[PDB]
Symmetry: C4
Subunit: 387 residues, 4 copies
């Protein structure tokens, strides 16, 4: 076991090849499957796992009632092997949490699970499943984190957290964590920015985060930083708007695009020089569909011209959160960091006539060989017996 270097560059990719699909809600129709949301993938040097926040209940059970609510004392962070349904019989317990992050530094797992009341939430940090540190809300307004993987470089793992209104300017801090212990932190000087649910990846020894602006931006804000938490911020300039909801594609902005900027969805993007791989919903108003768009100058250009589009989920099928995850050369044997992504396909409320809300997941990896667009939807036919 050797700590991840995190010193190679992102691998340029031409398309996305399908990696996993769990069919959790269909299997959950009769079988014993957790009610979950906020799934995300993270890999160790040996295996890849699906992390998820359960609601402490099973599908098609009465306790799945009201699971449109995001936070409660019953939600717990657990994990299972990629592609497998999150079941009590195959899942590892990670932490009690309604907001989370996780990553492997090359030696052991780091987990961050937030509980503590909305009035004063506390993040529980675990290293190899043992509590190693905590950090409590400093704004008393729903302390919250990535809902995707943290990024690790040379024995250090890095993440972001938000505390404050999701309806206005809040406070965002970046953390450097070593062996589950917070080593240093910094408050961003980001007036008029909004950061939530960052999807972060390492690239050439530094970390880049693409996040969600729930306040007033339909493009995605980003933050990049070195190991000392020296930061840079901005918004993706491409007119290929990445958030949901959003306007129809047009001339973009290097600042928050106010039109349809309120609310949003967790998402991701990969920066390549002036170019960007953008993952987004197909519908501009609800989380339907999913597509990957290559915009060769979208990081810095405000135009709406792109070069490649790959279908991921059909436009009439439900989608949801999406996030980045990487496979390090220590795992793959490649000479660069492999970009991958996962997609949450949310079924039930608020779009469907159920008493419950849960998601399935699909994942893809970036390749330079041939790929094809298709639709890999959840595919469950709702409602269920419980309704």
């Amino acid at each position: 076991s050797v700590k991840l270097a995190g010193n190679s560059s992102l691998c340029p990719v031409s398309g996305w090849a399908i990696y996993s699909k769990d069919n959790s809600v269909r299997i959950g129709s009769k079988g014993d499957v957790f009610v979950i949301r906020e799934p995300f993938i993270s890999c160790s040097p040996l295996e890849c796992r699906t992390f998820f926040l359960t609601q402490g209940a099973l599908l098609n059970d009465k306790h799945s009632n009201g699971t449109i609510k995001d936070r409660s004392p019953y939600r717990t962070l657990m994990s299972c092997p990629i592609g497998e349904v999150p079941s009590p019989y195959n899942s590892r317990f990670e932490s009690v949490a309604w907001s989370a992050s996780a990553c492997h530094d090359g030696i052991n797992w780091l987990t961050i699970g937030i509980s503590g009341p909305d009035s004063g939430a506390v993040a529980v940090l675990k290293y190899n499943g043992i509590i190693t540190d905590t950090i409590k809300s400093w704004r008393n307004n729903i302390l919250r984190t990535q809902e995707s993987e943290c990024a690790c470089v040379n024995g250090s793992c890095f993440t972001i957290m938000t505390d404050g209104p999701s309806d206005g300017q809040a406070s965002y801090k970046i953390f450097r964590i070593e062996k589950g212990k917070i080593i240093k932190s910094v408050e961003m000087k980001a007036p008029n920015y909004h950061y939530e649910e960052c999807s972060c990846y390492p690239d050439s020894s530094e970390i880049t985060c693409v996040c969600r602006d729930n306040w007033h931006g339909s493009n995605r804000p980003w933050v990049s930083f070195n190991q000392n938490l020296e930061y840079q911020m901005g918004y993706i300039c491409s007119g290929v708007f990445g958030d949901n909801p959003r306007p129809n594609d047009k001339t973009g902005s290097c600042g928050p695009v106010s039109s349809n900027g309120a609310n949003g969805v967790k998402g991701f993007s990969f920066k390549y020089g002036n170019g960007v791989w953008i993952g987004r919903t197909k519908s501009i108003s609800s989380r339907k569909g999913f597509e990957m768009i290559w915009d060769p100058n979208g990081w810095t250009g405000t135009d709406n011209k792109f070069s490649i589009k790959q279908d991921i989920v059909g436009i009439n099928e439900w989608s949801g959160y999406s996030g980045s995850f990487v496979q390090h050369p220590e795992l793959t044997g490649l000479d660069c960091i492999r970009p991958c992504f996962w997609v949450e396909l949310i079924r039930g409320r608020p779009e469907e006539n159920t008493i419950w809300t849960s998601g399935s997941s699909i994942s893809f990896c970036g390749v330079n060989s041939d790929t094809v667009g298709w639709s890999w939807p959840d595919g469950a036919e709702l409602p269920f017996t419980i309704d």
Copy 2:
């Protein structure tokens, strides 16, 4: 693999950070979950496990009928990873038992499971799952033990057992066990004391046990001893009464507090010099709620003044047994022994209109970083389909 030293002191702590929550009864509403009671946690140098006494039946099944009864030939001691529901598909069989203890000496697991009729019960000792010794009732009145973890120091593990009335003076013996073999035992000279269900931990090479007085004490009795079974006894003097039921807090006693002293609940406390961390119910009459109270002079002072209170379970929510467990530096890499505790949240009879009784569990670990009180209740809505 190296035997646990057990030679460092307890880590002083400022609050308790949540470690696990299993939601067993809610998940058990439809899924396959054991009917259990008397859960407790114990860790090896590599992992932490939840031990429990099953009743040999599943939740929401007819065989869960009458599970308010504590002893029967169907109850068995099994274990699973922390935070996971006790299921037949993820649980390791330990012993046939209606009273139990368990611990890791640094090399392998020691288990103690009692069966034998109330007229003549026999404790089955297992080391690495192999029977290594037995000890039979010497008073012919329900031989019984900790229902929490034993304590290990330098290759020796130590525990307590009771035989006799729970309605009056009984007989209590302390045991030194090495590799599952009883090495030495001693009968306490404890007239007017009552010891049941001790929660024991090691501290600076000696073991301290905080127990339950079911006869006539609403404060908790304690016993401390060295490796040779040289013992000291007393009651926690703090007016913060730790047992349940109990009187309202007032001036305490260094002897058994007779007021509301009958009956009780398994509990724990951590001794720090003259100070004590007290875990107790919030209601004085039924096992509702749970709270942690720091009484800087409560071990030896009879006053009711305390310095810190941390909410654990809301006052209107059901609780139950609680017990100590430790994480040794051999596991954590710390330079002191980490205090933790678990809480059993009993649902069903006798408080609720069910045919069955079972519990879920939550656990916390002591830290010096920021924490917050909240309520982490079982959260199942009873009754169930079976009723």
Copy 3:
């Protein structure tokens, strides 16, 4: 990994301490548990497992219908950890089989699973789960074997098989197996003897088998042999008759006791010089109850006087097959071979108004410390929802 020596003597024992109980049929009331019969235990140098012949169906399912039938193409030999219920989610597949044996030689598992039609059955031998040899029926009348563990000594494992009438004289052959390969075999010259379902154990470098006489003996026949298959035969002389059905205890015979000698039950006994540990049913006509009886001269004496009786299963509770299993010093660290036994508790047909038949299991190990009799019954209340 070192091959088992098998060169120490049996450990003298004073009582039997309970080792495992699975509660399979009660748990199977709702949960997913195999329909099984003929369970038996065998240990490796690291773990102990329950082997069993499934009927390829689950409890409380329509496919459990008619499972009173012993042989069919759907029965398979599988195994799980001791004490755990045989479930599709925790069970290892061993072989397709309606008659079986298994053992560990110190290096890997040997399995023997018989299929082939009653007209021509074929035993499939597996070593580390890989087919290594076969042997087909030589009498074309239900080739069958121990239904308990084989015995291993210095890299060789030994067993017995029967082919022919169970209503009269049949043919019995002893096998020496090395790494799953039959090395040598011999046909017994046993006129007027009947051998079925031998429970075999090693003792001081030789193997002893206690079996079932289904033809005309209510005492148990035995066979002992060295590694070259040089054999000795006889019947246990004790008037403590070990088979079921059987007469009331009286003066025994060193030959087959004709009274109530027809039919029988798989059983076991441990030979100690002229003494014997006898396990038997409590009822003389049906498989109810179970008890352990020490008859200090019962191997060679025809009297009915015994010294010790230990209750195992109450007289009004259903029992069934019983068999020997040993724990070798290579596993325990003892200086002798530990005698243990298991009991099958058959529920359903033919004694109960069900459509199905299945069993649970209990097991005990011999000790010289204090023990107690009790009753550890199956405890399920029949019939079930399927009936």
Copy 4:
């Protein structure tokens, strides 16, 4: 870990000894079992696994509806230990796929899972579960592969794929894969041949594939090649026709036998000089029954005379796909490559009045010791509760 040599010859065999039977559909009657088809076995140097294409649904669940359809975005390739039912609680996720192959090169697993629309399918190659390469349809007509194990020799694994009409001449390419990376490929010059679902095995450092002619041949086509993809092609000449449907046995052809040549079934055969071990259906019109036939000159002779027939599945019981798999000497310790085969027993549509289609599996290994014919059918009684 050492790469498989693949340099020994096939072991001559006299009969087939039963190796596994999963009873998946019967167990699935109540328990949680995947809807699957196209099962196949492949072994590593340590274990043997059942691979299968799920339909992302469970038996006796509404989502099993319409599972007669072969391709959809919900089907995924997963695996479990041999003999165990494919369940979400014991199955490893492999790939998203409606057509598949898998094999172990001695070091790690190679998986090939095809998705991409019928208009442009993409094969996802995984090595140790990590995507290593892709190949997309070149004829835009359902890119498809073996549905059985690939063959590995000296660090290289080899397989076949088809693209084009199954109603006429299509295009077939052979691939050499090293560590999950396609190293070289070649298009066959096979006018008037048709290759689908090849069952491939290594033999004396070269690979032989026996396949399915869905266009116009009732005998099976074959392809053999060395490591450089230098190929030879033909049809099995034996009048023992191997495909289904097929004519009654008569004088065969070394070319495609046009009579009843349309449609077919995945199958296998083992070439031994001029001889052949033929596995086939018992019915000539539907996939009923299964039998093994030794035709000592059937590879090159057009006659219908054979020497050995072994019953595998009774003529009135449902069967389906069959395929080859081998156990290498690296696993067995033998001095030759062991021939084995598996059989899929399809239950439900289109032969039975259900809403669903799924299969169980049986497997056998070639031996020179005594064997017997019998019938090992699926044995489930349909329809089920869902219908």
